[PDB]
Amino acid sequence: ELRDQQEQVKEDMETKCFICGIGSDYFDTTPHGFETHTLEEHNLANYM
Amino acid sequence: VKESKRQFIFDVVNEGGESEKMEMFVSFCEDTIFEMQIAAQISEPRRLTAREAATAVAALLWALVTRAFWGELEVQRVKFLNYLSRNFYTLRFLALFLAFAINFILLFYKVSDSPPNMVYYFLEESTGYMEPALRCLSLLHTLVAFLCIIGYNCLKVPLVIFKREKELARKLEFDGLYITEQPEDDDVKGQWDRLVLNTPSFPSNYWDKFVKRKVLDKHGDIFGRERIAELLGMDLASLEITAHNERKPDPPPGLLTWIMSIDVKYQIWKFGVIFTDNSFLYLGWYMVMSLLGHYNNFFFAAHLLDIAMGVKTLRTILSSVTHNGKQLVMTVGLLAVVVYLYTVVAFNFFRKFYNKSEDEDEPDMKCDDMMTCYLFHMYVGVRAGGGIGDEIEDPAGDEYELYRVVFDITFFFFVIVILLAIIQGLIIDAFGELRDQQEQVKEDMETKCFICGIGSDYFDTTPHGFETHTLEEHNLANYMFFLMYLINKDETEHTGQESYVWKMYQERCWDFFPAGDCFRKQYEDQLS
Amino acid sequence: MVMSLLGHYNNFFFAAHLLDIAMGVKTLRTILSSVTHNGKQLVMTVGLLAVVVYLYTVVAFNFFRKFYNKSEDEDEPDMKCDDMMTCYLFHMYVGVRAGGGIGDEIEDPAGDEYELYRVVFDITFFFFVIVILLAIIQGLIIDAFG
Amino acid sequence: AGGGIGDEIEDPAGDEYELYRVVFDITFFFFVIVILLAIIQGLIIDAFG
Amino acid sequence: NFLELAESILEYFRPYLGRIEIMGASRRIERIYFEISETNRAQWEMPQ
Ligand SMILES: CCCCCCCC/C=C\CCCCCCCC(=O)OC[C@H](COP(=O)(O)OCC[N+](C)(C)C)OC(=O)CCCCCCC/C=C/CCCCCCCC
Ligand SMILES: CCCCCCCC/C=C\CCCCCCCC(=O)OC[C@H](COP(=O)(O)OCC[N+](C)(C)C)OC(=O)CCCCCCC/C=C\CCCCCCCC
Ligand SMILES: CCCCCCCC/C=C\CCCCCCCC(=O)OC[C@H](COP(=O)(O)OCC[N+](C)(C)C)OC(=O)CCCCCCC/C=C\CCCCCCCC
Numbered sequence: 020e021l022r023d024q025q026e027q028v029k030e031d032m033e034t035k036c037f038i039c040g041i042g043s044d045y046f047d048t049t050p051h052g053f054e055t056h057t058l059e060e061h062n063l064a065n066y067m
Numbered sequence: 068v069k070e071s072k073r074q075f076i077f078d079v080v081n082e083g084g085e086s087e088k089m090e091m092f093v094s095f096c097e098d099t100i101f102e103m104q105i106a107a108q109i110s111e112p113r114r115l116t117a118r119e120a121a122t123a124v125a126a127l128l129w130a131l132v133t134r135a136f137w138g139e140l141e142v143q144r145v146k147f148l149n150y151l152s153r154n155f156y157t158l159r160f161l162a163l164f165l166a167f168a169i170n171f172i173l174l175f176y177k178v179s180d181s182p183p184n185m186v187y188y189f190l191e192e193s194t195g196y197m198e199p200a201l202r203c204l205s206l207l208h209t210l211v212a213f214l215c216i217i218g219y220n221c222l223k224v225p226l227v228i229f230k231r232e233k234e235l236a237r238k239l240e241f242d243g244l245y246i247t248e249q250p251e252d253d254d255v256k257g258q259w260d261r262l263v264l265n266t267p268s269f270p271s272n273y274w275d276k277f278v279k280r281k282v283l284d285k286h287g288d289i290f291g292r293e294r295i296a297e298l299l300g301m302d303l304a305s306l307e308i309t310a311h312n313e314r315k316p317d318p319p320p321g322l323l324t325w326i327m328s329i330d331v332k333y334q335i336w337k338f339g340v341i342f343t344d345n346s347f348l349y350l351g352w353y354m355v356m357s358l359l360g361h362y363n364n365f366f367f368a369a370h371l372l373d374i375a376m377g378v379k380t381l382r383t384i385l386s387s388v389t390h391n392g393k394q395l396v397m398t399v400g401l402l403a404v405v406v407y408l409y410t411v412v413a414f415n416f417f418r419k420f421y422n423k424s425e426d427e428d429e430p431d432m433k434c435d436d437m438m439t440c441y442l443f444h445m446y447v448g449v450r451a452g453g454g455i456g457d458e459i460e461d462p463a464g465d466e467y468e469l470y471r472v473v474f475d476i477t478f479f480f481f482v483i484v485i486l487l488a489i490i491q492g493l494i495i496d497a498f499g500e501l502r503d504q505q506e507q508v509k510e511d512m513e514t515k516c517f518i519c520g521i522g523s524d525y526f527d528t529t530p531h532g533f534e535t536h537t538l539e540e541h542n543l544a545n546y547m548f549f550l551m552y553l554i555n556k557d558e559t560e561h562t563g564q565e566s567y568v569w570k571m572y573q574e575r576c577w578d579f580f581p582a583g584d585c586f587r588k589q590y591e592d593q594l595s
Numbered sequence: 596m597v598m599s600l601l602g603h604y605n606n607f608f609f610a611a612h613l614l615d616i617a618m619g620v621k622t623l624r625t626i627l628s629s630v631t632h633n634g635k636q637l638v639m640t641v642g643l644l645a646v647v648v649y650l651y652t653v654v655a656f657n658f659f660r661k662f663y664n665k666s667e668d669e670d671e672p673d674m675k676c677d678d679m680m681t682c683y684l685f686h687m688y689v690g691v692r693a694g695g696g697i698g699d700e701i702e703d704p705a706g707d708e709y710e711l712y713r714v715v716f717d718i719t720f721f722f723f724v725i726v727i728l729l730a731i732i733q734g735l736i737i738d739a740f741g
Numbered sequence: 742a743g744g745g746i747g748d749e750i751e752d753p754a755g756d757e758y759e760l761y762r763v764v765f766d767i768t769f770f771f772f773v774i775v776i777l778l779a780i781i782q783g784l785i786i787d788a789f790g
Numbered sequence: 791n792f793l794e795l796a797e798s799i800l801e802y803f804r805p806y807l808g809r810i811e812i813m814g815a816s817r818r819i820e821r822i823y824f825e826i827s828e829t830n831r832a833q834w835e836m837p838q
């Protein structure tokens with residue numbers, strides 16, 4: 020159960036944005052789109 | 068090569084990320100290309116006796132394992148080394164078989180106080196052919212171990228050197244590891260690498276022979292052209308005077324020429340890398356134990372541990388245990404601490420019950436000192452089926468009976484039941500975690516393309532669209548073949564597209580790899 | 596059919612037909628498919644156990660022989676580790692089946708020059724053979740179910 | 742029994758059927774004590790999951 | 791062309807130019823730029 024919880028956390032963080040909730044595919048329409056979105060556009064560190 | 072590809076895919080999908088996916092892919096392609104070059108190089112142009120029970124059982128186990136003049140010398144030596152490189156794995160299997168045979172023969176030793184307070188260890192066999200067989204088998208095993216070391220050194224060490232040189236060159240040219248920065252002084256790898264930088268033959272296996280220049284020009288303005296030249300052991304005065312005017316002297320071919328043409332510093336660096344390589348050390352230990360086996364035949368039993376390294380099924384079963392090895396070790400430590408606490412309590416309160424002697428005249432108290440009590444607990448209570456209470460005295464009819472029954476029950480539940488349950492659970496969860504990793508790899512490879520990342524549904528819009536896309540359009544084999552073809556082709560013969568990809572590859576820019584896009588998406592409406 | 600015919604030669608050959616429940620009953624077939632799903636791994640694990648016990652036998656034969664006297668009559672000793680075949684049979688047959696390993700059955704190490712070497716020997720036997728390898732077998736079955 | 746029937750019935754050493762008997766006892770221990778009980782534990786553990 | 795000219799300043803200030811997205815008063819997603827201090831960024835990178 021603990022392993023499954025960790026895997027679920029990882030999958031969520033790699034599949035959808037934490038802030039807006041949009042899926043990774045839409046962003047990935049552009050090269051490294053999801054990476055750019057989660058590093059520059061919607062960044063938890065930037066919000067804090 | 069198929070096994071290497073499978074391992075690479077597993078690594079990328081599970082532990083690898085996404086920003087470095089193409090970097091790892093290109094590294095894998097480079098390693099595969101070098102491996103193919105090496106392969107091309109090496110390629111040639113009733114009553115039952117205990118012994119009766121023993122002979123039948125051995126056949127069953129082996130089946131499990133089986134199921135799972137200078138010019139003349141040079142040519143002969145090259146043929147020999149090529150043969151060893153070609154038959155390296157066969158030689159390893161032969162060594163394993165010889166080890167099993169030697170140990171089967173070992174199973175017939177006997178020890179006596181009289182010849183066939185010293186003792187005689189002699190082999191007891193009715194046939195009498197076993198002892199000569201043991202001698203010849205031991206000699207042959209040692210020979211095969213030596214040949215295995217040579218085969219490894221000629222077949223797989225080149226890849227190790229290639230990877231080390233490649234990594235060091237990339238760090239020098241794109242990180243300025245010894246120019247802009249410095250190793251951290253705990254990075255023994257870099258500290259040792261500081262030796263090949265000035266060596267005349269730094270890129271001996273890596274095919275990029277322009278590394279020294281590339282690095283010099285890129286970092287030259289900031290650090291000058293003389294500091295970089297000193298660090299890389301390259302002479303600008305030479306680079307210019309050679310172009311201006313130079314000579315080609317031909318040294319008289321001979322062993323003297325070979326001796327003068329030896330880059331000791333490189334060779335010394337090469338040997339450090341090899342002797343730090345794990346597999347080479349394993350083979351060396353194998354050879355050392357095989358030699359020791361001629362001093363004492365029973366050292367040949369150490370080579371039975373080679374089954375873990377050899378048999379794939381056993382390797383996986385043992386990887387199940389080692390997956391949570393750190394947790395298992397920490398659990399054993401926790402067990403030790405808990406047993407120590409129980410020892411403290413027993414030493415302070417329950418000492419009258421730890422008399423393990425039947426002779427009333429000669430008591431044997433196992434808990435009159437803390438060291439003895441702790442040893443008793445860890446050695447006897449842990450191994451006991453019901454804990455310490457099974458072995459230490461009965462508590463009935465004593466003032467401390469209830470305190471003691473609580474002591475024993477808690478020992479049984481915490482130590483025997485729970486901690487051991489934790490160990491079994493760690494192993495059982497390791498099995499499931501490995502299975503889940505394999506399933507994840509399969510699901511990813513069947514749901515999305517490795518290169519572009521587009522999902523399978525979009526391609527499947529067309530009959531067998533995903534299959535066609537992954538077999539013809541975006542094929543990992545085709546990409547690797549393109550890298551090989553582009554590396555072999557001359558830059559002067561490169562076409563425009565090839566030149567563009569070559570420049571991006573040289574600059575380590577992986578933007579030419581399609582990402583979230585493909586030919587079908589690009590020309591969707593015209594193609595439709 | 597052959598076993599049924601042999602059953603008329605000896606009636607006790609008819610017990611072989613009780614194995615037909617595995618083939619017949621579906622629930623039992625599934626339960627046994629759980630065991631046979633990783634049958635190759637189970638067999639290889641048993642082989643690994645045999646090899647490990649052989650290594651322990653080698654060590655015991657070379658160093659700890661005085662402790663393998665399974666006789667109470669001092670006039671008639673019964674040394675179970677004076678030859679490698681006998682010692683290996685003793686280990687595989689008795690230590691594996693023992694609850695706490697070989698140490699439960701072979702002699703007490705207390706008050707001997709090799710006491711610590713021997714307690715390490717026994718504890719390692721118990722942990723590697725009794726605890727871990729059997730844990731591997733249970734884990735293979737449990738993972739087959741899942 | 743912890744180790745099967747062999748723990749309780751007589752010692753096989755020094756008998757014409759010693760090897761047949763050690764095979765008997767080891768197979769009993771592995772099939773009954775180790776595997777079938779492992780099946781029971783596995784059924785419970787899989788029910789949880 | 792201006793961005794190429796100003797690349798140096800942009801690179802120097804890259805680690806300090808924080809950027810977030812909000813749903814603004816205009817009922818449209820708006821992008822806000824602000825300053826991140828070196829002390830704050832170091833504290834963020836602190837392993838705890
Ligand atoms: C999960 C599956 C369940 C397992 C079920 C039980 C497992 C049993 C396991 C292991 C083998 C133990 C040894 C078996 C006995 C051999 C003894 C022997 O060697 O004595 C040879 C005899 C000598 O002749 P006699 O004058 O004493 O006749 C006796 C006449 N009486 C019987 C009427 C008095 O010759 C004969 O009669 C033999 C003629 C008949 C041959 C078959 C008899 C034994 C069958 C054993 C099972 C098959 C092997 C099991 C495989 C391992 C389990 C996977
Ligand atoms: C990378 C993986 C690492 C794995 C490490 C495991 C390797 C095994 C271990 C240790 C070897 C240490 C070598 C040091 C000893 C130096 C040699 C020595 O001084 O030796 C003395 C005695 C020999 O006596 P002698 O003179 O009377 O011989 C008669 C010869 N004449 C008649 C000529 C006198 O040596 C004796 O006792 C001989 C008895 C030896 C029997 C035990 C050998 C080990 C075999 C099986 C167990 C393997 C252990 C596995 C543990 C690790 C698991 C991962
Ligand atoms: C595809 C799946 C394969 C599964 C294989 C398992 C089948 C069972 C095994 C082996 C049968 C081998 C047959 C060879 C023996 C030939 C016959 C023979 O020569 O027989 C001699 C003695 C009978 O003695 P008698 O002359 O005094 O009879 C009195 C008769 N008058 C008075 C007329 C003399 O035979 C005796 O001992 C009779 C005692 C027999 C009791 C054991 C029979 C087995 C029953 C249960 C265990 C099953 C084992 C399962 C192992 C595999 C698990 C997968």
Ligand SMILES: [Zn+2]
Nearest residue numbers: 036038039061
């Ligand atoms: Zn977002």
Ligand SMILES: [Zn+2]
Nearest residue numbers: 516518519541
């Ligand atoms: Zn694709």
